[PDB]
Amino acid sequence: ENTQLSEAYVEFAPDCTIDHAVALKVHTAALKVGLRIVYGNTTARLDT
Amino acid sequence: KFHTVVPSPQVKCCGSLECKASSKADYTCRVFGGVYPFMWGGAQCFCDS
Amino acid sequence: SSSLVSESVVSLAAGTQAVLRCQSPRMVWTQDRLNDRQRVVHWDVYSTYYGDNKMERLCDMYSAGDQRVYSSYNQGRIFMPQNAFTDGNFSLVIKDVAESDGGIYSCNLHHHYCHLYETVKIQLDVTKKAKAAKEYWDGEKAVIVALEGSTVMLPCVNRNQIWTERHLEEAQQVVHWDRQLPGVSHDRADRLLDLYASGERRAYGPPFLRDRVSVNTNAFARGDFSLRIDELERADEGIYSCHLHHHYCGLHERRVFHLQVTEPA
Amino acid sequence: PPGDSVTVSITSGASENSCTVEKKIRRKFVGREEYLFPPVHGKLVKCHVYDHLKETSAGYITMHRPGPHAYKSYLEEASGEVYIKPPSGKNVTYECKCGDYSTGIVSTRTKMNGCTKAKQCIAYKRDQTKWVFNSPDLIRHTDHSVQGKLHIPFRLTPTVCPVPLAHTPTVTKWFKGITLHLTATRPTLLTTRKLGLRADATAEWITG
Amino acid sequence: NPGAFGDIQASSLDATDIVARTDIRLLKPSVKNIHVPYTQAVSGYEMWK
Ligand SMILES: *[C@@H]1O[C@H](CO)[C@@H](O)[C@H](O)[C@H]1NC(C)=O
Ligand SMILES: *[C@@H]1O[C@H](CO)[C@@H](O)[C@H](O)[C@H]1NC(C)=O
């Protein structure tokens, strides 16, 4: 006549705190260039 | 089958040294500066690099 | 037992609350033991030649971390050995020194858990060619009159155990308050209190002495180990000695109070 | 070292008790070449290791009060009539349903019930003092509430690890190509790719 | 030729004079203590075996 109720669920393991894998969506790639220019035995920097 | 003899390294401390060749088979020699030998007793000798 | 760092003498009357103030900020401890043994070596150059020119933080490196070059342009130009922390060498290499690179560089090592730091300065003067390139000592640093358009190496190597990853027993801050009573010898003194950075506390003597002899509640959160001795009894005299130890960092401090008690007539 | 199961045993001087569980343990190591144990000389790389220190700052384990517990020694049925003998100096509750859900409390006492069947009444040594971790082998008190938490020690951390430097290959000469005399004593991973439009990715594991 | 038969050759088994090349290259020390790391090709005789 008795009865028993059983339930189960899931959660991320503690070690996940360092083993996580994250999914990303990327778009509109942008590019940055560092140029070094030399003129009249003088050196100049830039990054644009 | 052969056997690689590895005599303990020469150490010249806080000065300079130069490599020297020998007549032994496959003899290979090489110096290294800036080394810092350490051993169970501690630092073997003393001059920074 | 801890080596001599501070020794002092105190005198008070019986029935009064004594305060033997032992403190060591280097005994401060971090509750976070997650690789707390992080070391960061970074190079900071100030171009004093260019008038008041903002100093450039050329490069960072973290033990168990990358050698991040701060500015994209300097990538490749600035180099530090990859085994720097393994061997203790933290010297810098500038692949092609130019007039823009001239200035006083300064290597700085920082140890987070010990909250310690060190640093040394090296100058880099840029001369046009080899007819005036050399090295000398100014009085507080080594100065390199560097060959413009060629690689130049700025030396600094910290040969100490604090900056190496060899096992150190992972020690943490610990403290021992002893009381060498009159006629007793030091390092045999009856232990009065024992403390650890983890909050472990041990008391000695009769319960009344434990109530009277007591160290502050949050010692290691403040780097404080002051010993209160409430309602002094003349038997509470002697050489109180607080041994503070941190073997992972090398702390072996001794802080002593010669508390001689007196009584009325 | 690896195996197929994990076993924990304790010897009580005269008796020994062990409990085990299946688990696929296989030796693994970091780098592009699977060695046995790290050598004295080699490069330094990032790894993740469990700190050997009690202090932890990762994980969160629950804890709540225990459920009831049954026992047979609390009731005796040598005679036709029931008999309950709760442990001396210990409170006990007893329950059975004959006629109604009759329950009683006994403090070092042997109370009686009208119904006679041995199976009928059951006894709890209820204390509800110490909390317990949830497990399939326990039962839940009717409240079903979370009471406290605890830290799981010995948690992960990133740290430097040593890895071997494999024997450097010998490059050869070949018109519009190369031949590599690759020498290695343990499994190693070789990879390459062209620098043009086509990736032409190539990867291989070399044993000897 | 390293990694092949006849890497070590001696006019007689107990000849003091030996001629052999087996591609031994030293490596710079990079550890606290004293230690000479040598990297070498697998013995030719064993691979022929
Ligand atoms: C650059 O070249 C010019 C052309 O003669 C010269 O006058 C000048 O001194 C040079 N600058 C440097 C820094 O050498
Ligand atoms: C059982 O619990 C009741 C309720 O407080 C108490 O009065 C009694 O003394 C307890 N009996 C024993 C044996 O502890």
Q: What is the 3-state secondary structure (H, E, C) of C63-109?
A: CCCCCCECCCCCECCEECCCCHHHHCECCEEECCCCHHHCEEEEEEE
Tell me if residue C26 falls in helix, strand or coil.
helix
From residue D163, alpha-carbon distances to A45, D43, D47 in Å are: 38, 5, 10
Residue D47: CB partners within 8 Å, gap ≥ 6?
A: D30, D158, D159, D160, D161
Task: Record the tokens describing residue D21, joined without a space.
Answer: 């569980």
User: What is the best residue among A39, A41, A43 to mutate for testing ligand 1's pocket, by most ligand atoms within 8 Å of CB?
Assistant: A41
Chain A CB contacts of C75 under 8 Å are 34
For residue C223, give both structure tokens: 């780097």
C-E Cβ pairs (cutoff 8 Å, strict): 7
Q: Report how far residue B10's alpha carbon sits from residue B26's, in angstroms, rounded to the nearest whole number.
A: 19
Q: Which residue of C has its CA nearest to A44?
A: C100
Choosing from C126, C128, C129, C131 the residue with most ligand 1 atoms within 8 A of its CB, the one to mutate for a pocket test is: C128
Top mutation candidate among D107, D124, D128, D129 for ligand 2, by most atoms within 8 Å of CB? D107
Using CA atoms, how far apart are residues D13 and B36, in angstroms rounded to an integer?
Answer: 53
- The two tokens of residue E9 are 């050759």
**Which residue, among C243, C244, C240, has the nearest Cα to C229 in the 3D structure?**
C240
3-class secondary-structure state, position C116: strand
- Beta strands at C6-13 and C251-262: parallel, antiparallel or unpaired: parallel
| CA–CA separation, C113 and C38 (whole Å) | 7
Tokens of C58: 């050329």
Q: Write out the H or E segment, with its range, that includes residue A40.
A: none
Contacts of C24 by beta carbon, 8 Å cutoff, 6+ apart: C223, C225, C244, C251, C253, C255
D122/D84 Cα distance (integer angstroms): 9
Q: What is the experimental resolution, given in Å to one decimal place?
A: 3.9
Rounded to whole angstroms, the Cα distance separating C248 from C170 reads: 6
Contacts (Cβ under 8 Å, ≥6 apart) of D37: none
Whether D144 and E1 have beta carbons less than 8 Å apart is answered as no
As given in the structure block, the two tokens for residue C44 are: 């900071």
Nearest chain D CA: its distance from C212 CA (Å): 31
Spacing, Cα D91 to ligand 2 middle (Å) = 6
Map residue C210 onto helix, strand or coil: helix
Best CA proximity match to C208, nearest among C176, C231, C237, C184: C231
Locate B6 and state its tokens: 């590895």
- Calculate the alpha carbon distances from C108 to C42, C90, C145, C155 in Å: 5, 9, 22, 12
Q: Tell me the three state secondary structure of residue C4.
A: coil
Q: Whose CA is nearest to atom 4 of ligand 1?
A: A40
Q: Is C215 helix (H, G, I), strand (E, B) or coil?
A: strand
Contact C72 A32 (CB under 8 A): yes
| CB-based contact D202:D193 (threshold 8 Å) | yes
> What is the C153 CA–ligand 1 centroid distance (Å)?
26
CA neighbours closer than 13 Å in the CB half-sphere of residue C98: 13
Q: Note every long-range contact of B7-16, with CB atoms under 8 Å and residues 24 or more positions apart, other chains counting.
A: B8/E36, B9/E34, B9/E36, B11/B35, B11/B37, B11/B44, B11/B45, B11/E34, B13/B44, B13/B45, B13/B46, B13/B47, B14/B45, B14/B46, B14/B47
Q: Which residues contact D156 (CB under 8 A, 6 or more apart)?
A: A15, A17, A18, A19, D48, D49, D50, D51, D58
* Distance in angstroms (rounded) separating the CA atoms of residues D127 and D89: 13
Please name the method used to determine this structure. cryo-EM
| Phi, psi angles (nearest 5°) of residue C248 | -65, -35
Sign of CA dihedral D30, D34, D38, D39: negative
Q: Are D159 and D44 in contact (CB under 8 A)?
A: no
How are beta strands C92-94 and C18-20 bridged, if at all?
Answer: unpaired
Neighbours of C212 (CB within 10 A): 18
Cα dihedral sign, D21-A17-C249-C194: negative
Query: How many contacts does A have with C, using Cβ atoms within 8 A?
Result: 18
How far, in Å, CA of C16 to CA of C11, rounded? 11
Secondary structure in 3-state letters for chain D: CCCCEEEEEEECCCCEEEEEEECCCCCCCCCCECCCCCCCCCEEEEEEEECCCCCCCCCCEEEECCCCCCCCCCEECCCCCCEECCCCCCEEEEEECCCCCEEEEEECCCCCCCCCCCCCCEEECCCCCCCECCCCCCCCCCCCCCCEEECCCCCEEEEEEEECCCCCCEECCCCCCCCEECCCCCCEEEEECCCCCCCCCEEEEECC
Rounded CA-CA distance D89/D72 in Å is 18
Residue E27: CA atoms inside 13 Å, Cβ hemisphere, count? 19
Q: What is the Cα C123 distance to its own chain's centre?
A: 26
In sequence order, what are the residues at sequence separation of 6 or more whose Cβ sits closer than 8 angstroms to the Cβ of residue D101? Answer: D95
Q: Name the residue in chain E with its Cα closest to that of B35.
A: E29
- DSSP assignment letter at E14: T
Kindly list the distances between the CA atom of residue D42 and the CA atoms of C86, C262, E29, in Å, as whole numbers in the listed order: 11, 66, 10
Residue in the block written with tokens 């960061």: C40
- Contacts with A13 (C-beta within 8 Å, 6 or more apart), sequence order: none
User: Regarding beta strands C116-127 and C142-147, do their DSSP bridges make them parallel or antiparallel, or are they unpaired?
Assistant: parallel
Which residue's C-alpha comes closest to atom 14 of ligand 1? A41
Interchain touch D–C (≥3 Cβ pairs closer than 8 Å) = yes
- Our answer on whether B and A touch (3+ beta-carbon pairs < 8 Å) is no
**Three-point CA angle C24, C29, C30, nearest 5°:** 150
Q: How far apart are CA C69 and CA C57, in angstroms?
A: 9
